[PDB]
Design a protein around this nucleic acid. Sequence first.
RNA 1: GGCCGCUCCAGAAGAGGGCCCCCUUGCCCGUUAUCGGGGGCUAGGCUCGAUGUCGGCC
Lengths: 212, 224
Amino acid sequence: SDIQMTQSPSSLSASVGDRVTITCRASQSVYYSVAWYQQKPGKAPKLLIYSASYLYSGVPSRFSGSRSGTDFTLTISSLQPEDFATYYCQQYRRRPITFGQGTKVEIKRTVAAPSVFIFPPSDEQLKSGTASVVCLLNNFYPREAKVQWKVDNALQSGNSQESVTEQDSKDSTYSLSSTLTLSKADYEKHKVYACEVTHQGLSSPVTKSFNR
Amino acid sequence: EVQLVESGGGLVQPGGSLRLSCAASGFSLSSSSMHWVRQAPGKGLEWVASISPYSGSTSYADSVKGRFTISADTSKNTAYLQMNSLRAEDTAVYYCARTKYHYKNYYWWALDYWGQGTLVTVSSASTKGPSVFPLAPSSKSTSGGTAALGCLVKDYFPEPVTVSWNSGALTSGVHTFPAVLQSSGLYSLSSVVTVPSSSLGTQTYICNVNHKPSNTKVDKKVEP
RNA sequence: GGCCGCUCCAGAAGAGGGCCCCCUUGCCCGUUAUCGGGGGCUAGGCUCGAUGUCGGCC
């Protein structure tokens, strides 16, 4: 059986100065044969800790790890700007080696509500036979938003996709796009297209619509 | 001091083959065991294969047993990953990494140096250029504030595309969303800007899409 | 019924072996390689034995 590594939380928000802890439970004992890795987006992993608590050379002493049974903890005593990244555990007591999914360490900031904008498909696209309806959520925080699509008050599923920026370089917000793709045939069967957004910073849902 | 430059990856159809090469600097392959670890897009990390060049001993994950072959060539101080009969679940960034050998250690330990990864995409899609549509400022702006407008960049392969606004003359407020693989094997992507509604009449907004792997270059005006 | 034997078949049979927990490898050890001691479960499943309800021979 592969020993599995389960990492919680999937993400968390903290601020420069904070004490940060990430945990990782092993399916079964690995004794001390756990390592911790740091990875910044689109860049190589770097090793921080091995043997569950040993600091690999060059790893600033702010990093520590400990063990509690099959529970493994990575702790940043006081959080520096360089340390927001994804952290992975790895257990090498038994081959094959195995990794947890990772904890993403994000910047804390205050709540910001999304400005919502809706875009009907272009006449250019409408000629090609498809219709993309785009709905934009600008500069909000925290990441967890919900965009529900309503076509003639009917709720939609399976026909949209979202993409989300990474935290903005200056204000640490998110932006999100959701595209509802239909066939040209279906877009003109209907009349009112609505984007409905729910987020912490919004006391009641924000809806934005158009007709044609 | 230590280096690990990988290469030989890219785009290939299912069934096809590829040879990754991890060139090492600053250490000898015979003082190491080398490893390939992969990261499927948006997912975690996973170990593929390992080799100890001093002994020739090798090891493989089960999903890739019988398709992949790790090997070393110490005269070129380089390790190789031969990949055959590729399926689409082999799409990933492929990182090689080193574990140093320590004659007092009694077993191998963590992966302590990693190289920057090559990308491998396994799709049947054939390189196509993007179609650009405008995302028009609403004909209903709140009259005295900000507006939003953009370019929709649909049906292109492979990544990446690059967007700019007014040929770089507009960066404030620009968000280019990460690309999305649709249900048709092609990528889609949006880029948006906030500008003052006042400027809508007397400032022309033109985005510039450039897709290299197909040598495409578009320029779309956005207007009410 | 005697003598031999384990290629086969028994499970009527030990000891390997295996699994889990602890000790940051902790008597001596350790394949460019994850051990040892301790605690707890594993039996007919693999190797090796033993045995007969097995096989051979006079």
